[PDB]
Amino acid sequence: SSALGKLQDVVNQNAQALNTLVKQLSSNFGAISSVLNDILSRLDPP
Amino acid sequence: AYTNSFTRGVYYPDKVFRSSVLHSTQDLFLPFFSNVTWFHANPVLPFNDGVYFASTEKSNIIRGWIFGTTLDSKTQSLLIVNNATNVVIKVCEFQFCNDPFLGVMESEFRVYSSANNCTFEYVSKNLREFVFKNIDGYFKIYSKHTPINLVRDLPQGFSALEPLVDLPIGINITRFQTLLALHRSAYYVGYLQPRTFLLKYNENGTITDAVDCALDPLS
Amino acid sequence: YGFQPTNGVGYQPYRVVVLSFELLHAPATVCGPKKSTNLVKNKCVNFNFNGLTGTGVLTESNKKFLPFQQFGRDIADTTDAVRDPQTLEILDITPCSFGGVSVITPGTNTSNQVAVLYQDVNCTEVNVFQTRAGCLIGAEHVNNSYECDIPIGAGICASYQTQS
Amino acid sequence: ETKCTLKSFTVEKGIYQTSNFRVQPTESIVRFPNITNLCPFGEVFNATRFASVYAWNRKRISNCVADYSVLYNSASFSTFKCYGVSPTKLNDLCFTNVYADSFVIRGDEVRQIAPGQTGKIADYNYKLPDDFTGCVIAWNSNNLDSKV
Amino acid sequence: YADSFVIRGDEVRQIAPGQTGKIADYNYKLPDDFTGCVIAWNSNNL
Ligand SMILES: *[C@@H]1O[C@H](CO)[C@@H](O[C@@H]2O[C@H](CO)[C@@H](O)[C@H](O)[C@H]2NC(C)=O)[C@H](O)[C@H]1NC(C)=O
Ligand SMILES: *[C@@H]1O[C@H](CO)[C@@H](O[C@@H]2O[C@H](CO)[C@@H](O)[C@H](O)[C@H]2NC(C)=O)[C@H](O)[C@H]1NC(C)=O
Ligand SMILES: *[C@@H]1O[C@H](CO)[C@@H](O)[C@H](O)[C@H]1NC(C)=O
Ligand SMILES: *[C@@H]1O[C@H](CO)[C@@H](O)[C@H](O)[C@H]1NC(C)=O
Ligand SMILES: *[C@@H]1O[C@H](CO)[C@@H](O)[C@H](O)[C@H]1NC(C)=O
Ligand SMILES: *[C@@H]1O[C@H](CO)[C@@H](O)[C@H](O)[C@H]1NC(C)=O
Ligand SMILES: *[C@@H]1O[C@H](CO)[C@@H](O)[C@H](O)[C@H]1NC(C)=O
Ligand SMILES: *[C@@H]1O[C@H](CO)[C@@H](O)[C@H](O)[C@H]1NC(C)=O
Ligand SMILES: *[C@@H]1O[C@H](CO)[C@@H](O)[C@H](O)[C@H]1NC(C)=O
Ligand SMILES: *[C@@H]1O[C@H](CO)[C@@H](O)[C@H](O)[C@H]1NC(C)=O
Numbered sequence: 001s002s003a004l005g006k007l008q009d010v011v012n013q014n015a016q017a018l019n020t021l022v023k024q025l026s027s028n029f030g031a032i033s034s035v036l037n038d039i040l041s042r043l044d045p046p
Numbered sequence: 047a048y049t050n051s052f053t054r055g056v057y058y059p060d061k062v063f064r065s066s067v068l069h070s071t072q073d074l075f076l077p078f079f080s081n082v083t084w085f086h087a088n089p090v091l092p093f094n095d096g097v098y099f100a101s102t103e104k105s106n107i108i109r110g111w112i113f114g115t116t117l118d119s120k121t122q123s124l125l126i127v128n129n130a131t132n133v134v135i136k137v138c139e140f141q142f143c144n145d146p147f148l149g150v151m152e153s154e155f156r157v158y159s160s161a162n163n164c165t166f167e168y169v170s171k172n173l174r175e176f177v178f179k180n181i182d183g184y185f186k187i188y189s190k191h192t193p194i195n196l197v198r199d200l201p202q203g204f205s206a207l208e209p210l211v212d213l214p215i216g217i218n219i220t221r222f223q224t225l226l227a228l229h230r231s232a233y234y235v236g237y238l239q240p241r242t243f244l245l246k247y248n249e250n251g252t253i254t255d256a257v258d259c260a261l262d263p264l265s
Numbered sequence: 266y267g268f269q270p271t272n273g274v275g276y277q278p279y280r281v282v283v284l285s286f287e288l289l290h291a292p293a294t295v296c297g298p299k300k301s302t303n304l305v306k307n308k309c310v311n312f313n314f315n316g317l318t319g320t321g322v323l324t325e326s327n328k329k330f331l332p333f334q335q336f337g338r339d340i341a342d343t344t345d346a347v348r349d350p351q352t353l354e355i356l357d358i359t360p361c362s363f364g365g366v367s368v369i370t371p372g373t374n375t376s377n378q379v380a381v382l383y384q385d386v387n388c389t390e391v392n393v394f395q396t397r398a399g400c401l402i403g404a405e406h407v408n409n410s411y412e413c414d415i416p417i418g419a420g421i422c423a424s425y426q427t428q429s
Numbered sequence: 430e431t432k433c434t435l436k437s438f439t440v441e442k443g444i445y446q447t448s449n450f451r452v453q454p455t456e457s458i459v460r461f462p463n464i465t466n467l468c469p470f471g472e473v474f475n476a477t478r479f480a481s482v483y484a485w486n487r488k489r490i491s492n493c494v495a496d497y498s499v500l501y502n503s504a505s506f507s508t509f510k511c512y513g514v515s516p517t518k519l520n521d522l523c524f525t526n527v528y529a530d531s532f533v534i535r536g537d538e539v540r541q542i543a544p545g546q547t548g549k550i551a552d553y554n555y556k557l558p559d560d561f562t563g564c565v566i567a568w569n570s571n572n573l574d575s576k577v
Numbered sequence: 578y579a580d581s582f583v584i585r586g587d588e589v590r591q592i593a594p595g596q597t598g599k600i601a602d603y604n605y606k607l608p609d610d611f612t613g614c615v616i617a618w619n620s621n622n623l
Binding site: 058061062063064065067182183184208209213214215216250251252 | 339
């Protein structure tokens with residue numbers, strides 16, 4: 001009422017991984033943008 | 047004289063609202079605990095990357111700035127003025143007095159002597175901070191007006207600066223000045239560098255605190 | 266010019282105007298005319314506010330931006346609010362419902378009947394029974410409790426009794 | 430669907446994820462700022478005092494909302510010629526400045542006005558460049574500007 | 578398939594897999610998934 005770190009750590013690890021997964025949807029990896037509606041708007045299909 | 051900012055010159059770096067979070071940015075800021083010039087009452091200064099600019103009074107001695115590369119003809123410059131009426135932004139090629147000012151009868155404006163080729167017009171104690179920057183042909187201006195309970199010394203505290211005017215003034219910039227209302231009847235200048243900060247956002251979406259991440263090991 | 270109303274064709278005053286455009290430096294353009302289009306509400310749409318482009322359902326909100334703030338975003342940096350540039354009202358953005366579909370089979374060697382679960386979807390957006398695992402169609406909700414046979418989730422199971 | 434995703438004509442009891450599901454957008458909407466600056470264009474449109482040909486005017490045009498789409502569909506003039514892009518491609522752009530010069534000439538000489546021309550209004554009194562963007566509009570005003 | 582015709586001497590680069598042009602956008606198109614040869618030879622002597 002005034003220690004559950006082993007239970008807190010497995011929650012934290014899973015959340016830290018799920019956030020890293022979503023934060024990768026905003027990297028270019030060597031492209032002009034991160035949005036498909038921006039490559040499909042200033043580039044021809046080829 | 048020189049003085050020490052404490053935590054001053056923080057502006058909202060985008061239009062994005064944020065609720066209770068801690069957001070990290072890379073931008074041009076005025077580093078914490080910096081070496082800011084002191085001026086009393088003035089000369090041609092550099093620009094080189096943005097400018098912080100505070101000022102203190104109850105009367106209005108500070109009556110705008112003038113910008114540019116040569117502050118004359120043969121190249122274009124900006125001019126931001128305020129008589130007792132209201133602000134007058136203007137962009138022509140000018141001929142500026144090497145010591146330009148305005149009087150206080152109450153007749154004034156010995157500022158320039160030329161207004162050629164104008165490419166943009168516009169017409170219409172206290173602590174008044176301003177951040178001026180110039181990127182991709184846009185000249186951005188952030189500002190804030192806080193009330194001091196002193197008259198003319200730089201205080202301590204935190205207060206984020208909100209974006210104001212903005213246009214395609216462009217006009218390459220390398221130098222700037224100030225304008226003062228004479229006697230006939232205190233201001234500082236910081237510079238901005240690329241830093242990384244950690245801004246704390248309130249639940250209404252205002253920046254209440256910050257961390258400069260290159261001050262010391264704790265930061 | 267010697268003008269008179271009885272002059273021949275071509276000898277008439279013709280008022281002239283020419284246009285001459287500027288496209289050197291600076292990108293601060295005022296543009297011409299846009300073209301709004303009112304605004305629905307509570308439907309999956311393709312929206313576009315000033316260049317903010319996405320799809321979802323727009324509702325009215327209880328946020329309060331700052332006069333210069335134009336849209337909001339949350340942790341993980343997804344846009345979850347917006348300001349529309351004519352009413353000056355802020356709107357919540359919610360993704361348009363999606364999920365998985367599972368079929369509950371009592372075994373093809375026993376029957377050809379199936380039930381279908383739409384995972385974490387409210388039943389309105391698809392006899393019909395609402396669980397916490399989603400919306401379940403094609404299974405009757407009895408009141409007795411047996412051992413678990415096929416796990417549905419959140420405490421619910423399904424089974425082929427008697428025939429249904 | 431189960432038999433397809435399991436690749437088998439027999440299936441055993443269980444629960445099987447077979448596909449996904451999602452709601453489709455009903456329509457599309459667009460929002461944009463009003464105008465705040467209807468911009469000026471009447472001073473030169475409706476009746477007004479014009480100038481001579483060497484006293485041709487000039488105008489620095491500041492921000493504002495265009496409306497050419499109306500002058501394009503107007504077509505109540507003898508002349509609507511843009512050497513440059515079509516005005517269909519014009520009402521959707523963002524420039525820095527447009528310039529407006531105004532004067533009155535006779536009707537039997539308006540074809541002296543093209544970027545690269547000749548004659549005393551091309552040689553003297555006015556001058557175009559050879560490469561051109563803008564548009565030229567002219568209309569007779571004999572009803573009002575000629576008199577007995 | 579032998580497609581045989583005559584063009585202006587400029588838009589010979591308009592017969593190619595994947596492109597934009599007044600000849601390619603209105604009078605003749607090849608898919609981006611093209612597989613075959615293109616032969617061109619001059620003709621004002623015929
Ligand atoms: C855009 O224009 C419309 C009118 O064309 C404005 O609508 C008015 O908005 C005020 C609220 O400030 C209402 O009290 C009026 O009843 C509205 N009138 C009409 C006719 O709709 C709107 O405010 C304008 N917005 C901007 C940003 O310019
Ligand atoms: C220029 O101004 C005149 C006068 O204000 C406008 O003429 C009006 O046109 C409408 C529709 O044709 C008529 O119903 C009115 O009777 C006209 N006015 C008068 C006083 O009779 C004209 O529309 C204006 N031009 C433009 C392009 O707006
Ligand atoms: C600011 O820099 C000048 C440069 O000589 C130095 O003399 C002065 O002590 C510095 N001020 C502070 C507060 O460090
Ligand atoms: C204030 O200064 C501007 C600068 O041009 C001027 O246009 C304006 O007329 C001045 N105010 C008054 C009242 O004259
Ligand atoms: C700028 O002014 C000078 C002198 O008044 C003039 O020679 C020059 O043509 C002007 N610039 C333009 C683009 O007309
Ligand atoms: C500003 O000055 C630099 C000098 O290095 C010059 O190269 C540049 O073109 C100028 N800016 C513009 C917009 O011309
Ligand atoms: C602003 O924030 C304060 C404290 O964080 C809160 O009490 C208030 O409700 C918020 N909204 C206002 C003042 O409109
Ligand atoms: C499956 O069907 C076969 C053929 O009818 C039968 O022999 C077998 O018992 C069935 N399996 C069961 C009922 O578990
Ligand atoms: C499903 O939609 C209904 C209809 O508005 C609503 O009342 C209910 O709260 C929603 N959720 C559940 C679990 O029924
Ligand atoms: C199940 O039992 C509850 C008792 O609270 C009753 O209200 C409900 O109608 C019953 N449902 C069926 C299908 O018998």
